[PDB]
């Protein structure tokens, strides 16, 4: 039930060389990217196990005493101290702390390195699912000068693949470029391009820090006989402030909580079949059994029932009701599902049509109409999948979810006023990215926990990225504001 991710970092000489730029060294980039995954995994209460290994170091630390391999952090749940530890190698001062604590630029043999990593998976007392190793290096030919090592590394790499361990390569920039065909083509389990900016390394790593996890596997019925299986995923989910937990003052140990129900008179425990459900209207009571309150909610069996196809232009942008889901074929339940799915996708795209369906997530839930909107795959310049291929499950509001509002005369602005506003709009133009803002509230909450768990001098204060940069904006706008006002607001306002 717990996936495993080992972060493996190259400590060779070139990992600490920026290559003359206003950019971080591949090593700093790597450390910072690893901290990120550690922290995000905490923000979302992820139960995966993380590990941190370095190789090419002068100092070694592993159960078999293989040389130049340092297991900084064995596989375990992330915490405050482990994160704080990684921060010690951040930046230029970090570089100095790492090199003085472990040394760098020493020799090594990838085979020995991969053996140590595989062994960390075996030492896990917990049961595991996915076993993955993420390698960070800007060296594309480790043993191009030592066949005895190159050969052992390929064999071990192959043994990993046969053994169920996945090795992903997070290749970093190198003069002339990083050539995967030279060596790693036969090791890793179109590929991402090399990373040269933290941003890119982060997304590529984020794209793999967590494995797919369906919100539900359902049947998509074209009719009663033609049924395919699909996975429903939430590519977006509102990260909430983790709920509190009750502890025992004298030991800070978590406490279990049992909620029972008893007759007030006798004090006897009340079975679920010893109580009924009531609703009072006016001066009349209507009694139903628990079983019946659920039954009146029953309509369709869980699934997606195809209603037909509706042209996309008929679906309004302003009818949003709640976050959309993502639909992808689940070949593991119904063999043949992907082919039909792909066809539906290809054709819905050509005809700019959506598949209308009646949706029921689980048993005993009234249905909601949804529009499966065709979504074509999209990769950016780094070869990162920005948009996964499939269908956007768009929830449609029932008439009850719509609200009316009275409108007075339509008052429109003149070309001269719109022009002034246009000029203002163009001044405060910027490039929006779905991941540019952080949640002020969540961030502060964990900064606070950090200060308490690590006994820091003070709680770091989060930077509210949602607040407008007022002063900057004012200067950037100049007199456009006063101008706009003269065209719109009577001095007597």
């Amino acid at each position: 039930g717990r996936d495993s991710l080992i972060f493996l970092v190259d400590a060779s000489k070139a990992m600490f060389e920026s290559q003359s730029e206003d950019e971080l060294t591949p090593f700093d980039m790597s450390i910072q990217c690893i901290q990120s995954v550690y922290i995000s995994k905490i923000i979302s209460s992820d139960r995966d196990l993380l590990a941190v290994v370095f190789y090419g170091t002068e100092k070694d630390k592993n159960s078999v005493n293989f040389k130049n391999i340092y297991v900084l952090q064995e596989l375990d749940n992330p915490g405050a101290k482990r994160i704080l530890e990684l921060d010690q190698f951040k930046g230029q001062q970090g570089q100095k702390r790492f090199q003085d604590m472990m040394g760098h630029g020493s020799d090594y043999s990838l085979s020995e390195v991969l053996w140590v990593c595989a062994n960390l998976f075996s030492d896990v007392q917990f049961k595991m699912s996915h076993k993955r190793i993420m390698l960070f290096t800007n060296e594309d030919n480790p043993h191009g000068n030592d066949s005895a090592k190159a050969s052992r590394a390929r064999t071990k790499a192959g043994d990993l693949r046969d053994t169920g361990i996945f090795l992903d390569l997070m290749h970093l920039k190198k003069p002339g470029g990083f050539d995967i065909s030279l060596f790693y083509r036969d090791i890793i389990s179109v590929h991402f391009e090399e990373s040269s900016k933290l941003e890119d390394l982060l997304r590529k790593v984020r794209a793999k820090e967590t494995r797919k996890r369906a919100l539900s596997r359902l049947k998509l019925k074209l009719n009663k006989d033609i049924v395919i299986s699909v996975g429903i995923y939430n590519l977006v989910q509102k990260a909430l402030k983790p709920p509190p937990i009750k502890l025992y003052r004298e030991t800070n140990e978590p406490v279990k909580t049992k909620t029972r129900t008893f007759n007030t008179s006798t004090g006897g425990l009340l079975l679920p079949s010893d109580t009924k459900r009531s609703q009072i209207y006016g001066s009349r009571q209507i009694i139903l059994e628990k079983e019946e309150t659920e039954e009146l909610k029953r309509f369709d069996d869980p699934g997606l029932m195809l209603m037909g196809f509706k042209p996309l232009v008929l679906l309004k942008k302003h009818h949003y009701l709640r976050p959309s889901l993502f639909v992808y074929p689940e070949e593991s339940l119904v063999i043949g599902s992907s082919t039909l799915f792909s066809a539906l996708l290809i054709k819905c795209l050509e005809k700019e049509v959506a598949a209308l369906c009646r949706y029921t997530p689980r048993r005993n839930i009234p249905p909601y109409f949804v529009a499966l909107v065709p979504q074509e795959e999209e990769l950016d310049d780094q070869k990162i999948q920005v948009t996964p291929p499939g269908f956007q499950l768009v929830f449609l509001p029932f008439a009850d979810d719509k609200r009316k509002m009275p409108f007075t005369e339509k008052i429109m602005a003149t070309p001269e006023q719109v022009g002034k506003m246009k000029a203002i709009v163009e001044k405060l133009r910027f490039t929006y990215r779905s991941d540019s803002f952080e949640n002020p509230v969540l961030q502060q909450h964990f900064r606070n926990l950090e200060a308490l768990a690590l006994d820091l001098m003070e709680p770091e204060q989060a930077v509210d990225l949602t607040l407008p940069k007022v002063e900057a904006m004012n200067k950037r706008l100049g007199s456009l504001v006063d101008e706009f006002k003269e065209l719109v607001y009577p001095p007597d306002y």
Partner: protein, 530 residues
Amino acid sequence: NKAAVVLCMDVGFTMSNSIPGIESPFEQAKKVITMFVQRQVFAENKDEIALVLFGTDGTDNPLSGGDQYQNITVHRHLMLPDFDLLEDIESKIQPGSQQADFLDALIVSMDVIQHETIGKKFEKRHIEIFTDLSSRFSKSQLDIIIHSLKKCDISLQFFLPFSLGGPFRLGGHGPSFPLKGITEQQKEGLEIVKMVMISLEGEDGLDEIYSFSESLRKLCVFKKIERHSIHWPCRLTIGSNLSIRIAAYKSILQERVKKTWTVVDAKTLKKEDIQKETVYCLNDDDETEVLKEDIIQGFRYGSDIVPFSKVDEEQMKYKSEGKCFSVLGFCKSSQVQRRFFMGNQVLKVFAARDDEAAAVALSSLIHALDDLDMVAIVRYAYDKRANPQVGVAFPHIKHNYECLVYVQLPFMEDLRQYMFSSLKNSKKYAPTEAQLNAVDALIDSMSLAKKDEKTDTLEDLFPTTKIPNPRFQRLFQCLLHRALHPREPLPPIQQHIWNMLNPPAEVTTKSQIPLSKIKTLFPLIEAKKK
């Protein structure tokens, strides 16, 4: 705030003409009225409702003086609806053997509103007529009728057996009794109804004439008595020197059940007889209880457990200035994809009410963004307590009004970058040419739209956003059933409900052959391994 409504029902002889398998107008109208009264009862509004019947055998109304307005009965006088009204509708009220003047029924209906709304303050007075326009009637009171409706601010709606604009399915999507199948008397009555509605509403008056069938799958019967939304005052700020007074209303907001089920004792059927006591024990083995005077608050930080009291959390807690709607910047609309929409609402933002300066200012913004194909990225915070949100405000320009539509955008911590295998470049699941053509034929047969009335316009044949959430009227049918028949188990779902949740019978029929070809072209079988 409150409304006075008179349901004017036709229970005349013709209302019972049963068509071999097709429900009579009387029974259809009876379902629509029950639908309306049920919602008014279970939602516990303050609207007052009267019920006038015409075509009845007897005569009982405050205008019969002088052998006039005969066969018109005021079954229920203006007052809060109750279970006795619903029961009468369902069981007592029987079809009549006569025929009454429908404009006379309207006049009696107007009388009820005029003589009984006395003193009480009603924001709205409304009359709903349910008839088949089968019989003769006088047209001498037309001007009198219209003059009183307008002067007394009384709105009107009509409900007939046929639409105004094959196997019959009540509440379905598709039938249209041709205006030719109706009698000549009905064509005359319909013209008058049209004239009346046009005088009262204008061009759109035609829109207030419905078929009983379509009424069952709409909220139109409540349309003129719907609770108007509350406005939210605030200033849209650009920098710190430009403020614009605005008012926001929620356009989309999921409707939920209001009444909760109270757990009670199966014998006393009372709530006080039940009580819940939540105790605490050491989760680890040796389940030892603990007293409330020994438990503190804490949080998890990965594997760490961190005690953090609500008092300390209260002060270190992130705190904002408060209410706001601040622009952070503007960007191409293309950089904002709908698949990233967040939250559980949509907000329409208008200039503050009656503020022309604010309106012109906002209109400037709207049109500039529209003319630049851009949108605003803003910080929205309901109040000083609410967690602040980042969101998009995009231009919404119509002919009757203009505004910005607000929808929340996601925070980085809300995203999940799950990678998915490519399907276009699939070396396993690429469909053959025949499979693609079968799907292509399936999509055409199952089209839910049509370029009808030849105007290059797309007519939606299955507009789901007009259909009411089925759980409500289903719940009401049950709540009522349990009230009028305590010993009986719950009734099954009404067919008209199922009929409105399904596509036009036309669509279903066309797809059969195409579906058959797809079943043979696309093998599908459940996995036995893994």
